[PDB]
């Protein structure tokens, strides 16, 4: 039987790698590749998954978010009607960890919320037992709050202050950080949100000596880096935005998992098109259970209970003289510092 | 005088289209600043492409101001799709039956999708009110990692933390898919697939202990491991037929549009199509009117997250045999 594996990738250069990865993966079943680019209008993307992917009887769809405005939701929802497993490769927003909405989603990347797992260790590495946690009243920010809170719970150290996304003037919040005797500050915002905090903090003298700014990847990215304060510590997912390596790895994953699934018995054929197939792929949930349950280009490939990637390292970054330096690397459990010395805000 | 707005009432295998037509076509929405022009569409194909290519085609031919969706399935993926549709066309959709009403917490910021149904916190409140009636102040909770899990536990522990009466929460368990503990009243919270495996122990049950789960466990009440005497919270799917809900959804869209025009002297321009996009402020204004619609005295407001503020909830007992034993209106239990 021909088992086709679908993909929604960035451009033709990447769909090339995917069909080449399927090619170098066929070494009873033959695997064939069916791939498309994203459609900038997401309704038509939902119909393109029906007419170009599920119309080919797909066993799993992989989806790359390109370097904004294109989300995997149109593919997750459509394929999520049946439960054809969808393997994201790039997007890290924690909305995709909620299994009660995204019903057959795995991703070879950790969500942004999981970066709290590093700051925990920073605290345990610097004896920071009292933090002020500044986050956007957003699903992603509170995702960071929730996981930082639970791994702190062994939340007195956690003093949270919320701001509504799109708030330009944040003098009130940071003024309250001053009233709370703020020293170490963790922030979880979007790029243009983090920018707002950054400017508000450099105008009441909240970035100088005595302050520690601990921060994830989005806050040290794009627009936010330009105005990010001198001495801030950020994060950076290794092999994160490398779409190729994730295509190659996830193709290896679905290959091994296709073998393991055909080793089982009573595996039905996926639906052939959307119009007419109102019923669910019977052997879908089992196949994803196989996918969630090796070694690869990006690292130790393994998923947690939601299908999110486990065992991922972060480039630990410090902004020295308005330039990002790697002061260390997060093993995946322990956190290791390299030769370079760390500089705090002020010095 | 009152302008007409186009509401699509889409019925997916939802007989009978006659009883639904006749019920609303006598509601005189004059005495409103806006009156509805309803166009039903009966469909048999319930897949993402068919639903999408129905909504979009209806938008491009007629001027569609609101969509009312009723379903005959237990497929939650319906709701997400329509909430995904809602947001990308900024046109209101109300999921009033079936999978369109399977409550979807945590959905799109841009969404205008609202469901006839309750939140996890609301039915938890109904549970603890059942106990307050018959004085079961000693209970447990047993939960899986399935989402909304903590929100449920959170709601229980909160309503009794902020109280003076002597609530005694015994043990709070979090299964994986295994320990023994003895409480007379429990609160099970999980999926109906995982519930049967959990219910498979000491068919713990069957002697002097009652068990109480919500709509998440009762599921399709018209469909071995389940205890006899199980008490559940569920939406009123007995004395509130599809005609009554189609008509209520119509009333909500029509009243929202009317209140907006009687205050702002205009209602939103219907959406050109799905393919085109270019030519947000109008959508959010109507959203504000949509979630605060008072009709027939009856308060039909919505939460900003997409569920009703006051759903018609019923307390059911488990022969076959789920049977209503109580009703919940506002904050009271008539059992």
Curated annotation (Swiss-Prot), chain A:
GO molecular function ontology, one term from the record: NMDA glutamate receptor activity
Glycosites: 32, 169, 242, 266, 313, 331
A Gene Ontology biological process term: sodium ion transmembrane transport
Keywords: Calcium, Cell membrane, Disulfide bond, Glycoprotein, Ion channel, Ion transport, Ligand-gated ion channel, Magnesium, Membrane, Metal-binding, Postsynaptic cell membrane, Receptor, Signal, Synapse, Transmembrane, Transmembrane helix, Transport, Zinc
Positions on the Extracellular side per record topology: 1-347
Annotated localization: Cell membrane; Postsynaptic cell membrane; Postsynaptic density membrane; Synaptic cell membrane
Coiled coil: none
UniProt GO cellular component terms: neuron projection; NMDA selective glutamate receptor complex; plasma membrane; postsynaptic density membrane; postsynaptic membrane; synapse
Disulfide bonds: 50-274
UniProt main location, coarse: membrane
Transmembrane helix recorded as keyword: yes
Domain topic, free-text comment: A hydrophobic region that gives rise to the prediction of a transmembrane span does not cross the membrane, but is part of a discontinuously helical region that dips into the membrane and is probably part of the pore and of the selectivity filter. The extracellular N-terminal domain (NTD) is a site of allosteric regulation to modulate overall receptor function.
Quaternary data: Heterotetramer; the NMDAR subunits are modular and harbor tiered domains that function in concert to regulate opening and closing of the cation-selective ion channel pore. Forms heterotetrameric channels composed of two GluN1/zeta subunits (GRIN1), and two identical GluN2/epsilon subunits (GRIN2A, GRIN2B, GRIN2C or GRIN2D) or GluN3 subunits (GRIN3A or GRIN3B) (in vitro). Does not form functional channels by itself.
Family stated for the protein in its record: Belongs to the glutamate-gated ion channel (TC 1.A.10.1) family. NR1/GRIN1 subfamily.
Role summary: Component of N-methyl-D-aspartate (NMDA) receptors (NMDARs) that function as heterotetrameric, ligand-gated cation channels with high calcium permeability and voltage-dependent block by Mg(2+). NMDARs participate in synaptic plasticity. Channel activation requires binding of the neurotransmitter L-glutamate to the GluN2 subunit, glycine binding to the GluN1 subunit, plus membrane depolarization to eliminate channel inhibition by Mg(2+). NMDARs mediate simultaneously the potasium efflux and the influx of calcium and sodium.
Protein name stated in the entry: Glutamate receptor ionotropic, NMDA 1
Positions spanned in the full protein: 25 to 384 of 903
Swiss-Prot record, chain B:
Cell compartment(s), UniProt: Cell membrane; Postsynaptic cell membrane; Late endosome; Lysosome
Glycosylation sites: 44, 292, 299
Chain positions recorded as Zn(2+) binding sites: 97, 237
Consequence recorded when altering residue 264 to A: Normal zinc binding
Known tissue expression: Expressed in the hippocampus including the dentate gyrus (at protein level). Detected in adult olfactory bulb, brain cortex, hippocampus, striatum, thalamus, superior colliculus, with much lower levels in inferior colliculus, midbrain and cerebellum.
Disulfide bonds: 56-274
PTM statement from Swiss-Prot or TrEMBL: Phosphorylated on tyrosine residues.
Reported impact of residue 97 to A: Reduced zinc binding
Side Extracellular, residues: 1-335
Top-level taxonomic group: Eukaryota
Domain remark in the UniProt entry: The extracellular N-terminal domain (ATD/NTD) endows NMDARs with a unique capacity for allosteric modulation, harboring several binding sites for small molecule ligands that act as subunit-specific allosteric modulators of ion channel activity.
Assembly: Heterotetramer. Forms heterotetrameric channels composed of two GluN1/zeta subunits (GRIN1), and two identical GluN2/epsilon subunits (GRIN2A, GRIN2B, GRIN2C or GRIN2D) or GluN3 subunits (GRIN3A or GRIN3B) (in vitro). Can also form heterotetrameric channels that contain at least two GluN1 subunits and at least two different GluN2 subunits (or a combination of one GluN2 and one GluN3 subunits) (in vitro). In vivo, the subunit composition may depend on the expression levels of the different subunits. Found in a complex with GRIN1, GRIN3A and PPP2CB. Found in a complex with GRIN1 and GRIN3B.
Family: Belongs to the glutamate-gated ion channel (TC 1.A.10.1) family. NR2B/GRIN2B subfamily.
Protein purpose: Component of N-methyl-D-aspartate (NMDA) receptors (NMDARs) that function as heterotetrameric, ligand-gated cation channels with high calcium permeability and voltage-dependent block by Mg(2+). Participates in synaptic plasticity for learning and memory formation by contributing to the long-term depression (LTD) of hippocampus membrane currents. Channel activation requires binding of the neurotransmitter L-glutamate to the GluN2 subunit, glycine or D-serine binding to the GluN1 subunit, plus membrane depolarization to eliminate channel inhibition by Mg(2+).
Protein name (record): Glutamate receptor ionotropic, NMDA 2B
Species for this entry: Rattus norvegicus
Upper taxonomic lineage: Eukaryota, Metazoa, Chordata, Craniata, Vertebrata
Name of encoding gene: Grin2b
